[PDB]
């Protein structure tokens, strides 16, 4: 998900934020952490 603070291309930014969150999720151990990945 994103911030929900954008009026232009919000859903596009949300996708970009989702990628960032997934990367950070991996940086937090990813699947080895036991925590489900972000959506």
Element (H, E) at 27: helix 10-27
23, 38 in Cβ contact below 8 A?
A: no
Which residues constitute the domain of residue 20?
Answer: 1-39
CA atoms within 13 A on the CB side of 12: 3
What's the domain count of the chain? Answer: 1
Whose CA is closest to 11, among 22, 19, 2, 20?
2
3, 17 in Cβ contact below 8 A?
A: yes
Method used to solve the structure: NMR
Q: Rg of the chain over CA atoms, in angstroms?
A: 12
Token pair for residue 35?
A: 């925590």
């Amino acid at each position: 998900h994103g911030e929900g603070t954008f009026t232009s291309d919000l859903s596009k930014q949300m996708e970009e934020e989702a990628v960032r969150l997934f990367i950070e999720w991996l940086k937090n151990g990813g699947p080895s952490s036991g925590a489900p990945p972000p959506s």
